[PDB]
Amino acid sequence: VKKTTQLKQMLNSKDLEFIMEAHNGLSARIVQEAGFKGIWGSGLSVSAQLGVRDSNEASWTQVVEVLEFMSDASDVPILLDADTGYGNFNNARRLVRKLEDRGVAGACLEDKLFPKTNSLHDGRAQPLADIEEFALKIKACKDSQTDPDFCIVARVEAFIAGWGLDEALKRAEAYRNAGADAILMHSKKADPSDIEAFMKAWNNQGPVVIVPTKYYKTPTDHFRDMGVSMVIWANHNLRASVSAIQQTTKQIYDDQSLVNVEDKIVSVKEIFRLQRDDELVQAEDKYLPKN
Amino acid sequence: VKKTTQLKQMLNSKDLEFIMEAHNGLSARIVQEAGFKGIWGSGLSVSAQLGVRDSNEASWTQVVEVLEFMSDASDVPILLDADTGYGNFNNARRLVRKLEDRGVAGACLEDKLFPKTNSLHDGRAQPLADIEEFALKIKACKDSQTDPDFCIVARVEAFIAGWGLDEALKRAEAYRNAGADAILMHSKKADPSDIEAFMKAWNNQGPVVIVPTKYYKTPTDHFRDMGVSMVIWANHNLRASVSAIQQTTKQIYDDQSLVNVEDKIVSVKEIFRLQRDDELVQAEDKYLPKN
Amino acid sequence: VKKTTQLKQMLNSKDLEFIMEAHNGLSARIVQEAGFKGIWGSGLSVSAQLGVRDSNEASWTQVVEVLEFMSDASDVPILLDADTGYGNFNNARRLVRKLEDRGVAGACLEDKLFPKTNSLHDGRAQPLADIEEFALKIKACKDSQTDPDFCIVARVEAFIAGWGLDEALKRAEAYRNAGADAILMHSKKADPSDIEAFMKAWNNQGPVVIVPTKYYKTPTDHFRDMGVSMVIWANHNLRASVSAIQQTTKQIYDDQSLVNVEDKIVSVKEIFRLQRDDELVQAEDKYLP
Amino acid sequence: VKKTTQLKQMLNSKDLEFIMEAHNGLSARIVQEAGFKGIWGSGLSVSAQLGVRDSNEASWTQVVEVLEFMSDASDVPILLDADTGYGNFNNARRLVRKLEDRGVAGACLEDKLFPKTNSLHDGRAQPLADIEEFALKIKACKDSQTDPDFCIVARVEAFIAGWGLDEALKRAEAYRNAGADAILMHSKKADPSDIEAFMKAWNNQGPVVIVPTKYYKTPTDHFRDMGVSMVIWANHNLRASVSAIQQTTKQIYDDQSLVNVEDKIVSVKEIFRLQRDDELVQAEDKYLP
């Protein structure tokens, strides 16, 4: 069961699926250990851990390198938030090849311009890619694949860009017909209005993916009611990690002692176990001259 | 005030200094924001976030790349736990040049063999570098510097390797004479016995650095009593980050909702602020055609 | 002196300066030893040694690393041909900083869209960037540098695209007023007419850089007479390398032997010297018991 | 067929096979087109194009990326000269996996210590690894591969180091029993005596690979008669490239013109073809409105 196949099956499953954000090898392993069937390589969380902005500042090969360590450290599929493809169809298809090679299950591309701006920002230019063009990019990525099960998810930032339903629906149809394996309908509204609207008008033309970050209060079962195939928990490991580090850093700063953190944080032996140090020990005993 | 100078002054200060571990650009920014005058680029925390082991699995340029993002995102000096230098004096001095160029304040090298094993492990081969040799490596690094204030810290893993005080003291003296800017005396004992022993026998021949991880219960003021120049909080941001992600990942998994994490983790706007998104906005308004 | 200073001095000299193309650490060291005062970090050549197209396929950091090995191997400046900057102003300024830290001396940015298309191509569409946008991108780079001598060369593709003198001048004036340290007027024409027409109208507002690839018969003195501050031999070492590799590979493939190539190629000791292996020997003597 | 399979088939053929050295994407594509069935990823050449020494100065991942561009640009196999493996068995097995994923066909590891020293050097100390340790490292690689055809070539430096036939055989037998797919017996001698002495005692236990650099006058047929399965022309394209770059750079530097080099170097259109620019044109036609 290759990772691509897994991700393909989750997207194609009538049953509602869940992938969780990870932004590095360590968090990739954790998401997997918790039982999640999938991982979301958040464009924002990856750039965030690096300390840069979610606006194509890190190079795409740097994004892929980060993701390489993530693939190596996980057995479950990683869908990478690949922004706009980092350029035209050619940059797009080249990225798809690097992704397959590293074991990454799929890439998600958004109909915006390079470089992009995070979707959660209010009052900022959020210009769209010409529909017909973005579709060819979708198709060029699909055509370029070597692995049939690799997934290409198209993201309609129409609602995000302030446009209406007709626009969103138009784009979705265009990219699904272009071969996309699922359509990601985004919105920043605090309510599920836009999703409710698209889904109603979509008439199950294809698996749909959503990012409930801004309307988190919405009852999950409601997504099943609408018939969404997969939900993406987009950035909570990143956000929790900050709290923990800010709180821990503050506490250690103030007390100039480790006394007040030792019991609130994981042990050194838990780290060693997450790196699979026992496997090296096994191997060391096996490939190193006994004495 | 260059970063090297800062780190030089902290090491040389009679006053006890504190540097905190960071393992990526994001945590580097946080450690700085909390007020810390320095950052510890933990060999283990860096390899841990990548998902590999603290045994030279990631390449040194991958370690340096990680550290590059960290330097860019911080104004305070970063001392990098550089293991054994990733090879002989030549690999050592080449690393020192890359470090200067990226803005990194200094490198800490340990008298062990390549590839190394984390020091916190019990019952594992912890073979030492020939003293005279490691000293030349120290000297070759010092000689190679372009920036006079860059720091080279020598780490005596003698106590760690199970040897005694005479050995530790011998090594320390050898490397200090070789030019090192501070000696890092390590131990895994649950008590400060070894440090108390070295410091007593050292007679302030040079600034000494310590990693209190295993004897964290020891009263900090006691390090000042002994005359230690700097303490290193080696891996607590890494460990806290795991707790947070494991707990958060578990909670989201179980509830299939974001309802129970939203209030326990930092906000999306706090992330944007840690990436300094406002600076880009300023710049965007300034270098992008108004309309 | 400082590489950036070395290069700014060249762009501002009243003398026709020359910078040779290099595409990896090794060729950059050769150029250096040959006497050249500067190196042209050819995007085409750099992409070509990687076996990829001059179409922004290789990430901008991969190009940066290539140039890092190159800067490391030379004491003279390297002007990196950074295509259109690999993005918007933000991507450009991120580039300028890194390039600075890596020891590179300057960046030449061109006014086309990302991803770009090589200039010597015919029939291929060459879209031009908005003038203000590109000009604002030049300012941003100039404002972002931390070494006042690092040079930002603005490159006009108006001719390559198929437009006229009137269009080139307007773009060149705009970029120069934005803070460019020099203007590079390109042309794929058979003669120097485009450069002539421009140099004549330019009135020496700022240093002008050119690439004679397609009009290489123009006698060099003519550029001096036009006032051209710098010339770029942009891809000859790369083209030469290929010629030599194709032939040595053919000869060996056919002879199933090395006797017919060993006397037509530098020696292994020559490679060691180019790698400055002698320095390592002196160093091993100091730092190895 | 699969690159790894292509290469394993070559090491096991009863025929004397040849693999040519390449050091970047471009030369690898040239080697491919010339007809060669395999490419030798020369550590010396790879380090030399970077402008650095064959002394493990460039990280093992930087070498990997270089080879990635190389694998991407060729349909034939590439045997990477991975020096001593860049560390202990663990570092070696990490290497094998990456190399696999990048499409490389095999790795040749040598029994010296990290960081290594080029073999053609004289007087330089050449420390040998413990036999069991190195043999155990070979097993580890063989046990770690996920593509059964990926080949692990073990390289004996006993002669290069200055020891005798008796030492080479023992090391070669040990590594072969550990699972090596082939043994590479090196020698910097003026004649094939070392190879002779070894091939004779070897009794064809396994495929044997050689590098004729220093004894290039030996007629190739003699290797066939000795039973040698593969020969490596290890650095000629790199040495050729330098010769051509040194001369083209000299000529241009002196003429302050291109007329005397433009007729002695491949054309710009030749570079485009080598970059498979034609494929992009076909693609732009499909995927651009």
Ligand SMILES: O=C(O)C(=O)CS(=O)(=O)O
């Ligand atoms: O996590 C990301 O980077 C996303 O794709 C979703 S958003 O943050 O852009 O809304």
Ligand SMILES: O=C(O)C(=O)CS(=O)(=O)O
């Ligand atoms: O944090 C590290 O990697 C250290 O140098 C200290 S220890 O973890 O090795 O004890």
Ligand SMILES: O=C(O)C(=O)CS(=O)(=O)O
């Ligand atoms: O070498 C390059 O990429 C150049 O800048 C010159 S040209 O090939 O575009 O004419």
Ligand SMILES: O=C(O)C(=O)CS(=O)(=O)O
């Ligand atoms: O090209 C190399 O690095 C070789 O393996 C052959 S030798 O140069 O070491 O003889």
Ligand SMILES: [Mg+2]
């Ligand atoms: Mg995103």
Ligand SMILES: [Mg+2]
């Ligand atoms: Mg450490």
Ligand SMILES: [Mg+2]
């Ligand atoms: Mg160019």
Ligand SMILES: [Mg+2]
């Ligand atoms: Mg070699």
